[PDB]
Amino acid sequence: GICKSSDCIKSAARLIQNMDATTEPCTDFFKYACGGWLKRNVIPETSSRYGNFDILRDELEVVLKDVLQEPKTEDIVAVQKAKALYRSCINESAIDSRGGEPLLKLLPDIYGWPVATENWEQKYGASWTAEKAIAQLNSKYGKKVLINLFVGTDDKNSVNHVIHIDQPRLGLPSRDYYECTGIYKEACTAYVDFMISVARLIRQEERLPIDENQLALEMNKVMELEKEIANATAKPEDRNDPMLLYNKMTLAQIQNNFSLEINGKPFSWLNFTNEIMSTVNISITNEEDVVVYAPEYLTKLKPILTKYSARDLQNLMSWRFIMDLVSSLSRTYKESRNAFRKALYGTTSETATWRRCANYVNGNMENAVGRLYVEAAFAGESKHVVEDLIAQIREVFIQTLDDLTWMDAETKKRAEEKALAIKERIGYPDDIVSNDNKLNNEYLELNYKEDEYFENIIQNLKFSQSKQLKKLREKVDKDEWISGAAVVNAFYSSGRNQIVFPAGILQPPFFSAQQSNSLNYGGIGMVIGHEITHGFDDNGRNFNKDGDLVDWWTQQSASNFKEQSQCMVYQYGNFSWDLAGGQHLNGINTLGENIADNGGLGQAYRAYQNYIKKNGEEKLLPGLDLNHKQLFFLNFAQVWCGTYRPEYAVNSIKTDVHSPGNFRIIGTLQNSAEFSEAFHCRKNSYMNPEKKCRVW
Ligand SMILES: O=C(O)CCC(=O)N[C@@H](CC(=O)O)Cc1ccc(-c2cccc(Cl)c2)cc1
Ligand SMILES: *[C@@H]1O[C@H](CO)[C@@H](O)[C@H](O)[C@H]1NC(C)=O
Ligand SMILES: *[C@@H]1O[C@H](CO)[C@@H](O)[C@H](O)[C@H]1NC(C)=O
Numbered sequence: 001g002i003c004k005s006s007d008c009i010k011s012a013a014r015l016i017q018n019m020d021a022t023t024e025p026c027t028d029f030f031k032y033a034c035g036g037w038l039k040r041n042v043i044p045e046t047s048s049r050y051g052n053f054d055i056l057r058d059e060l061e062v063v064l065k066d067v068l069q070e071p072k073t074e075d076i077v078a079v080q081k082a083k084a085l086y087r088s089c090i091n092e093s094a095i096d097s098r099g100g101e102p103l104l105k106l107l108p109d110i111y112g113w114p115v116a117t118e119n120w121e122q123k124y125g126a127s128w129t130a131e132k133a134i135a136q137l138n139s140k141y142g143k144k145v146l147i148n149l150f151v152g153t154d155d156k157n158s159v160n161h162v163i164h165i166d167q168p169r170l171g172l173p174s175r176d177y178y179e180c181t182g183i184y185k186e187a188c189t190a191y192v193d194f195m196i197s198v199a200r201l202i203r204q205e206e207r208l209p210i211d212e213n214q215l216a217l218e219m220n221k222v223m224e225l226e227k228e229i230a231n232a233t234a235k236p237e238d239r240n241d242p243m244l245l246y247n248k249m250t251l252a253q254i255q256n257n258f259s260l261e262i263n264g265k266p267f268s269w270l271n272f273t274n275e276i277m278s279t280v281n282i283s284i285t286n287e288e289d290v291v292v293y294a295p296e297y298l299t300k301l302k303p304i305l306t307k308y309s310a311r312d313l314q315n316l317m318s319w320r321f322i323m324d325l326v327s328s329l330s331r332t333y334k335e336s337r338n339a340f341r342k343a344l345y346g347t348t349s350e351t352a353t354w355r356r357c358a359n360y361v362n363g364n365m366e367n368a369v370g371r372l373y374v375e376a377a378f379a380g381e382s383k384h385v386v387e388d389l390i391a392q393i394r395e396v397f398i399q400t401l402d403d404l405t406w407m408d409a410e411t412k413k414r415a416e417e418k419a420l421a422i423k424e425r426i427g428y429p430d431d432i433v434s435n436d437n438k439l440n441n442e443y444l445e446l447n448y449k450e451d452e453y454f455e456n457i458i459q460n461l462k463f464s465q466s467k468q469l470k471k472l473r474e475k476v477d478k479d480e481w482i483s484g485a486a487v488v489n490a491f492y493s494s495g496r497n498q499i500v501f502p503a504g505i506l507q508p509p510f511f512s513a514q515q516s517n518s519l520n521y522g523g524i525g526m527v528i529g530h531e532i533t534h535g536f537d538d539n540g541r542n543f544n545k546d547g548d549l550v551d552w553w554t555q556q557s558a559s560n561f562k563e564q565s566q567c568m569v570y571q572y573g574n575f576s577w578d579l580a581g582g583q584h585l586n587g588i589n590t591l592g593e594n595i596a597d598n599g600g601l602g603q604a605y606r607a608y609q610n611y612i613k614k615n616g617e618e619k620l621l622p623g624l625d626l627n628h629k630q631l632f633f634l635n636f637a638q639v640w641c642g643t644y645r646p647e648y649a650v651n652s653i654k655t656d657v658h659s660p661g662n663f664r665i666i667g668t669l670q671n672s673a674e675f676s677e678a679f680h681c682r683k684n685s686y687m688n689p690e691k692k693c694r695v696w
């Protein structure tokens with residue numbers, strides 16, 4: 001009664017090798033599931049995090065290398081363009097021989113970098129306004145500094161786009177880093193040294209004098225400016241109510257309630273919008289509707305932006321771009337980032353060039369590279385099997401609603417509408433395989449020179465930003481996939497109410513028509529549940545079946561929802577993480593993900609119970625004295641075998657909306673009565689707390 005296929009053997013070995021059978025399952029299921037893997041693996045010098053999930057991403061990269069590095073007769077123009085981009089990217093001896101010159105040529109188009117220009121005021125002062133400086137970085141290069149302006153889907157009207165105004169991102173990973181004490185100190189030091197070093201390299205190249213004390217003073221000014229911007233931005237916890245974030249206005253209204261004075265100007269929102277929007281032949285009047293995500297921030301900016309000169313601001317604005325571009329230049333410029341990378345990620349070296357190149361071209365040519373990938377790696381048959389899993393799990397979710405005693409009947413019915421309404425996307429869009437010419441047309445405006453990597457990425461910057469801006473007066477495309485196919489991940493989009501499962505994720509350990517179904521439900525099954533559940537988390541529940549941000553909850557049901565979910569805030573907020581210096585997770589920032597992990601697990605396990613009930617028990621696995629209910633949980637846990645560099649734990653605990661893997665595994669299993677039964681856990685054993693959190 002034992003499976004002895006080749007596939008069963010591979011499943012078995014992997015499970016056996018990862019686990020540590022000498023830990024007790026009810027003490028620490030993560031150790032039990034992953035202890036073997038932990039004992040045996042070291043984090044590569046180039047990874048900030050390592051583990052089964054990252055290995056999957058590393059192996060996907062290998063496939064990409066194989067499909068990009070070799071020209072073939074039969075290659076369509078779209079594919080040709082992608083391989084050309086790749087070749088430009090991996091030719092380091094061409095890149096190296098150009099030193100910093102490509103960047104130098106670019107510098108005047110952004111109003112220079114004051115610290116590395118002499119007589120900056122003389123050269124740029126008369127013609128410099130915030131409106132145009134900021135606009136330039138935004139419209140031409142996709143770089144958002146100080147004020148973030150973008151075109152995106154209207155939250156309250158999902159068939160349309162609108163302009164958005166939000167707070168910008170920071171050079172360091174989060175606002176927390178800007179306190180610059182304790183765990184953040186080295187990052188602040190590296191950050192300022194990084195600026196110093198780049199300005200010193202550019203000064204050496206242009207043949208200009210170098211006063212070291214001037215560099216220190218000017219760059220620390222940059223940090224002091226960015227420290228004040230960091231302080232002005234809203235915490236992620238004060239941004240997670242999508243209802244309270246959305247503030248539709250007019251540029252008219254915005255000029256009153258949110259005035260600024262920069263270099264004693266003062267600022268013109270209307271000038272600013274047309275500077276950006278003119279980049280694609282669309283002009284704007286005070287009529288225009290504008291969604292404002294950071295009203296408090298704009299207010300907090302007024303007293304700050306009056307204190308700094310054009311030279312002070314341009315120093316930061318430029319640095320924030322330059323920062324991004326430095327790895328794209330010569331070896332000399334590449335080194336300047338070393339300490340900065342180490343302080344944020346813990347990595348002592350950059351990842352292989354071919355790897356960064358594969359990721360770069362994937363990210364800029366997702367349909368072309370997705371096509372190459374799926375032809376090389378993805379079954380295609382898998383698609384129907386996964387389709388049926390989604391139906392089973394969509395089903396379960398709907399049924400679970402009727403056992404929700406805390407939700408009223410009208411809210412129950414409206415939840416069911418959205419569930420039936422969820423659109424799924426599996427593997428890849430067929431277009432990319434079956435319609436060569438359409439794929440060719442997508443990349444029509446792109447022309448890459450093979451020995452001009454930098455010009456290539458600059459061209460890529462403009463093309464992306466142009467595509468995005470030109471959408472303002474356009475209706476949201478329905479058939480558009482929110483991810484390329486060569487991705488090891490999955491997605492839910494509230495704005496389309498759709499779930500996405502790329503080819504990249506439809507492989508072991510998540511999925512294989514050739515692995516036990518206990519593994520399949522435990523893996524991709526859980527992920528399906530996780531993504532359906534996103535439709536209904538602290539964020540998704542605010543969005544209806546059509547992706548529009550409308551309240552469809554009765555006071556009571558919503559209010560009860562918040563009670564149930566308060567449990568998980570406290571559960572996860574009380575996990576504390578050794579790797580991150582004993583800091584505790586943010587139970588609010590990670591709430592949505594934690595809700596989705598917990599929901600997903602229940603649905604996937606109930607679907608597997610349904611499957612056993614409809615089909616009977618599956619053949620056992622050789623070497624493993626576990627039944628299939630236990631195997632479901634094992635595989636489920638081993639998705640997250642892995643570990644973090646302390647540097648990157650410090651980072652991710654402030655920036656990741658997911659809890660760290662160990663804690664996702666602990667948190668979900670602790671809340672699962674079903675887990676403790678499968679594993680026969682003593683009450684109040686660590687894996688089996690008395691209080692259990694439940695929402696879906
Ligand atoms: O790699 C990263 O940094 C994040 C990966 C990441 O979570 N992606 C998700 C994208 C998202 O959030 O919908 C898709 C996803 C992947 C794995 C799991 C899973 C599997 C087994 C057990 C548990 Cl407790 C969770 C749940 C969701
Ligand atoms: C890299 O650099 C230059 C491009 O002009 C040239 O000498 C050489 O052919 C290139 N090498 C490769 C492998 O592309
Ligand atoms: C940060 O912002 C708050 C509110 O505007 C204020 O109490 C304080 O002045 C700011 N702190 C620093 C160090 O700039």
Ligand SMILES: *[C@@H]1O[C@H](CO)[C@@H](O)[C@H](O)[C@H]1NC(C)=O
Nearest residue numbers: 129131271272274275276278
């Ligand atoms: C914005 O203002 C400047 C002067 O401050 C002016 O020269 C320019 O025409 C305006 N830009 C746009 C895009 O209307």
Ligand SMILES: *[C@@H]1O[C@H](CO)[C@@H](O)[C@H](O)[C@H]1NC(C)=O
Nearest residue numbers: 569570571572573574584587
């Ligand atoms: C930890 O749990 C307690 C009791 O549930 C709760 O009152 C407290 O706020 C939690 N702490 C965090 C940081 O979430």
Ligand SMILES: [Zn+2]
Nearest residue numbers: 530534593596
């Ligand atoms: Zn998620």
